[PDB]
Amino acid sequence: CPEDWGASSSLCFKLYAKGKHEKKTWFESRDFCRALGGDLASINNKEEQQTIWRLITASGSYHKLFWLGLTYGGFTWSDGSPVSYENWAYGEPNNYQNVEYCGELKGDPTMSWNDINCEHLNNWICQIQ
């Protein structure tokens, strides 16, 4: 793995929790990780989770929340029929997009996930190959 990046025993993870003043939104966090050649960290098994936890330990970043690459995201007819026709007014539909939800990691031994407004300022975790 790159310059000190949690080595999955596969994937490399790196925490980013410098200060509460430079926390980013999910989108910014994702741009930051992508500009590095990777992306926001994805957790696909217990192993990957232990790794991030060791990183949290090794750095003393207990209890901090981190953005993970978790993201959520059309209209259907109730009766089941297919949407073979549309007559939306200009710009419609549009409400189903004023808010989006993303998943954050609770940095304690439970290592649990919670979804929240993708616009919250948070620490984040990247993953490079």
- d(CA 26, CA 73) in angstroms, rounded, equals 14
Tell me which of 22, 36, 49, 114 binds its own copies, using CB under 8 A.
Answer: 36
35 binds, among Ca ion, its own copies, none (CB under 5 to 8 A by kind): its own copies
Q: Is 112 in the site for Ca ion (CB under 5 A)?
A: no
Q: Is 114 in the site for Ca ion (CB under 5 A)?
A: yes
The residues facing 102 across adjacent strands are 71, 116
Q: Is 35 in the site for its own copies (CB under 8 A)?
A: yes
57 or 114: whose CB is closer to Ca ion? 114
> Phi first, then psi: what are they for 98, rounded to 5°?
-75, -15
Size of the site for its own copies (CB under 8 A): 4
Q: Is 58 in the site for its own copies (CB under 8 A)?
A: no
Q: Which of 28-36, 66-74, 96-104, 113-121 is the region at the interface with its own copies (rule: CB under 8 A)? A: 28-36
38 or 103: whose CB is closer to Ca ion? 103
- d(CA 126, CA 122) in angstroms, rounded, equals 13
* Dihedral (CA of 118, 120, 125, 129) sign: positive
- d(CA 48, CA 44) in angstroms, rounded, equals 7
114 binds, among Ca ion, its own copies, none (CB under 5 to 8 A by kind): Ca ion
- d(CA 28, CA 48) in angstroms, rounded, equals 23
Binding site for its own copies (CB under 8 A): 34-37
